[PDB]
Assembly symmetry: C3
Homo-oligomer: 442 residues x 3
């Protein structure tokens, strides 16, 4: 039944297209002048509603899915599967970063152009920042893993601020911990996997609890169906809202066209050559057919700019349309949503290269490898915090000591590349799910 | 067994009467002069303890009851039942507001009297307020519906503050969202109903989870029994505490007797003529007998001034004493506790009319209809926030542009009318439960 | 299998010993000068990780254990068991306080010595404090019992700050409530016991829910096993971190040797004569063998300085090694972890006596009894708040009006005596568990 099967793909594609058309027409016809902030808020609001609907069920879905999938196979197979999945994510993220190096060195976006100016973008506020240390970020990562409390971990995550408690002499900034908003999805993933291993290692005592969690998860898929049916409207109004929020006739595109073209082509080549080729090589099966099976979550990733938010739609689509195993999907896809950030590593690396390129820095081999490794680590380093969309580049440049004086340039256009990032991240997660499913089948 | 059956009614009535006697005697004998703030806190404390006990179980009770009642009948019958319930609540709230217009126009409480003065009540602090917009309030309502997170929704609710991020020119206050304390009982109700529909649409997978939620709820009724047995002591000390908190020899009654008489008679006529008449007309059965069946929750509503807090006692009383169906009670009464505010619409409307009446405003027909409609909407608009006992009148007067310069007059006596409001709200919820039960029986 | 059975005892003892050796060697070799704050944070961090791991599971473990143990015996037996347990805890805490009086009067630590000076310790900051009232502390205790919300009670606890809302005249500090961080473990214990009674009073409806909670708890024991296997590393680095945090060559020991010797000998005599003698007298069974069975939690108590944190390890050890009944352990040990603070009452009393002794106060009989009773009450009074490690002594001295001008002396060395306190508290809990188990056996 092609007409009924493909209707969602048609709606979300038409919704994105109508969103760009609506927002461009509104902006050309006056935009905010005709709108005002109150009508702007009401215009964006259905997008916010979609995010609120999707951020509601990621907690039940992730927790119950990991508990019900981790306890569907013995711990030895679980360990082999997880180790191979972590290796696949690490390899793809490293490859994406190297690919970004390759394009950014070649196309040369940091040539002399309008983007040389940074007074308007920075205006002195770029240097003023928390300036979080790399060791502190890794410690906050390892403390958001193994959370202090599970309930607070369902809406809070450790972040280490810095105080000036060194009044005795030579004032130096010293860390203090204070939980701040944002889910600890990584901590819940770890606790859920560990708990599922525990129930599998129990026997008749845990059958009840597995049945509980699987039923809870299936009810959450039942919610996901209806949120999917709503999702095109939210995508339309969210995309339209964000392009009325800043004029996009082509001024920033004319300013940073080479950079944005690198980031988008890097995401496309990573999305449309590499991971498809890996899927070819290993499972010998059609990646473009599989990719077509998952278009509504990819469009939702584009619309939402949040990999965790599109995950329920993605798990529903992958289990329903594509012939992916339920337990493999349950285990792999949430872990991919908090570890695997191929596009994030990509445009973080391309950003670092671009800002090094302007002012004519060297970046011969050692600095290249450092950016690769720290980008691969920051793929998960940014995962714990939702606020740090591109904030983690600053700590990389602190580690490698590059000019952070114009980091604010990308904040004007973080909202475009991060969408393709989210698309690529969920894409890599799904391709890994299919690949590992067919391993476990073999 | 009349002697054992009616003992609770006797205790709570005697507790309210002893509370007023105790507080009046303490106030006449010196009150705070003989008491001091520390003994005042210890005096009020058992009332606070009762509220803490009741605010503990509304979350488990509401969530599990809606999940266990929503999944006891098919979604078509659920939709018809819910639509008719929402219509009944809307009709009763609209009627209560119109009734308030009718009394407030006739008895004329805004005549020239001591209440003409407002310098002491306001003293310039009345104008200083958040001044929340109507669109912003509706958006916060629709964001507390569909919560961002369920766990935080179990003790937090979206409220839109306003900042001054328009330093570029013509400084205008712009909204910012920040979650603030207070349960999102509306959001949990919606999620629970939706989830119960999901489990009914599943089959054998959800039987386990329905049995879980029903058992959890029955255990919470078991707690409700003992909290009921404690409740008269808390009611006594809470009423006594609140009348020692302000002298009530008759000064404020002499100041605002016409207003308070309108609000109380409006609640009585709504409670003792209208909803009884509707129950007569539809089910042909004794409303005063039914009303006598539920007196302990009504007295608790009077004592607590919190419709959500008396709800567990109300559900226990309605399922146990009166012949109301378990599933109908479970579904209807929590929804009534967060949507149906007949008395709230009533005294909000009467307050608006009274303050319009002093200074001799017109309010011919169009303004009357606007106050009716915005009061019917603010019945649920105030439900999401516990802090806004009478705060939502300010946004109505902002919508219709009346003098808010003496809104602080009612804050001295918000504590009296709101009790009868809570009584009427829970009364309307129960009458709707009986009426809709007998529809579903037919 | 002695070699495999005793390996954990060997690891944790060797870990504590290696911790003191490592920290003393680091401090002598330069300490912070060679370390810096960043490496200091990384050095302490595995200890923080152990606390985070243990603070994660106390909520599931305590809640599910009480629900599964409270509903394993009828309410009459539960009431007799609980009343005898509360009496045993009260008797042991009172005895510990009296024992502290006996040593502190005799050994005389408040003699004229270096500890007479307090300018360096206090410097005027000792008097500046919240100065919480005794009535307010008891009210906050009774409000953390019977929490307003369960979810917030899983990471927040009521604390009454004080404002200056008396600008009318004679400015006096008036209480205001505001929830502050720290679990309401007492409130969850009460709700869980009450809920378990509810499920036992139900029949077939609650069997499902008991099976759920028991399975959840057994999975949490499965986590406890692995946290136990990690625990020696955390103990080593935590002890080493805390002794590098302050130089401990003997300066503070030379300053307060008599005081610390009293506190440690009081804990030892309470731990090694009294509770063993009570166990002798009642069950006629080997307390030192039993004490040897539980050494890893006692060492963890020493390392962590947190009675609630070592509780999962303690329950696992007591149910597994020693022949203690599952339901008795489940019921008694969490209650002991939030009520029974024998060592806390002890060193609070010894602290009060010591500061009275310097400046040569009388403390004849009545003041002695007041310190005994208020210490026995503050055993639980400090339990609700984790921050008040020794903060509750100030309210005692406010009650009895002693010099608080040098309370900051103990803050330099609160970190040593509180460890032996935690050891003694968990010890008394376990001895009570064995004693009451053998009563119920009889």
């Amino acid at each position: 039944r092609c007409l009924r099967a493909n209707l969602l793909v048609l709606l979300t594609v038409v919704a994105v297209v109508a969103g760009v058309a609506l927002g461009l027409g509104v902006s050309g016809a006056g935009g905010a002048l005709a709108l005002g902030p109150e009508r702007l808020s009401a215009f964006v609001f259905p997008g916010e509603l979609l995010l609120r609907l999707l951020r509601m069920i990621i907690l039940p879905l992730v927790v119950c899915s990991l508990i019900g999938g981790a306890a569907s196979l013995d711990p030895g197979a679980l360990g082999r599967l997880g180790a191979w999945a972590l290796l696949f994510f690490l390899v793809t993220t490293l490859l994406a970063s190297a690919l970004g190096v390759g394009l950014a060195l070649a196309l040369q976006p940091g040539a002399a152009s309008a983007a040389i100016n940074a007074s308007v973008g920075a205006a002195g506020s770029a240097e003023n920042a928390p300036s979080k240390e790399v060791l502190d970020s890794f410690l906050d990562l390892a403390r958001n893993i193994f959370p202090s409390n599970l309930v607070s971990a369902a809406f809070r995550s450790y972040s280490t601020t810095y105080e000036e408690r060194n009044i005795t002499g030579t004032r130096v900034k010293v860390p203090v911990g204070q939980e701040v908003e944002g889910m600890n999805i990584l901590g819940l993933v770890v606790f859920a996997i560990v708990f599922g291993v525990a129930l599998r290692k129990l026997g008749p005592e845990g059958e009840l609890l597995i049945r509980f969690f699987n039923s809870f998860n299936e009810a959450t898929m039942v919610l996901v169906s209806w949120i999917m049916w709503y999702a095109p409207v939210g995508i339309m109004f969210l995309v339209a809202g964000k392009i009325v929020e800043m004029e996009d006739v082509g001024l920033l595109f004319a300013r940073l066209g080479k950079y944005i073209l690198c980031c988008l082509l890097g995401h496309a080549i990573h999305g449309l050559l590499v991971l498809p080729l890996i899927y070819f090589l290993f499972t010998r099966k059609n990646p473009y057919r599989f990719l077509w099976g998952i278009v509504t979550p990819l469009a939702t990733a584009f619309g939402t700019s949040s990999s965790s938010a599109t995950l329920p739609l993605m798990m529903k689509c992958v289990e329903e349309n594509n012939g992916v195993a339920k337990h493999i999907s349950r285990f792999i896809l949430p872990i991919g949503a908090t570890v695997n950030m191929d596009g994030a590593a990509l445009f973080q690396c391309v950003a670092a290269v671009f800002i090094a390129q302007l002012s004519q820095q060297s970046l011969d081999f050692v600095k290249i490898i450092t950016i690769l490794v720290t980008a691969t680590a920051s793929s998960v380093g940014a995962a714990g915090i939702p606020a740090g969309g591109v904030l983690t580049l600053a700590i990389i440049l602190e580690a490698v000591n590059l000019p952070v004086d114009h980091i604010s340039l990308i904040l004007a256009v973080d909202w475009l590349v991060d969408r393709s990032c989210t698309v690529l991240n969920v894409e890599g997660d799904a391709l890994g799910a299919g690949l590992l499913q067919n391993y476990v089948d073999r």
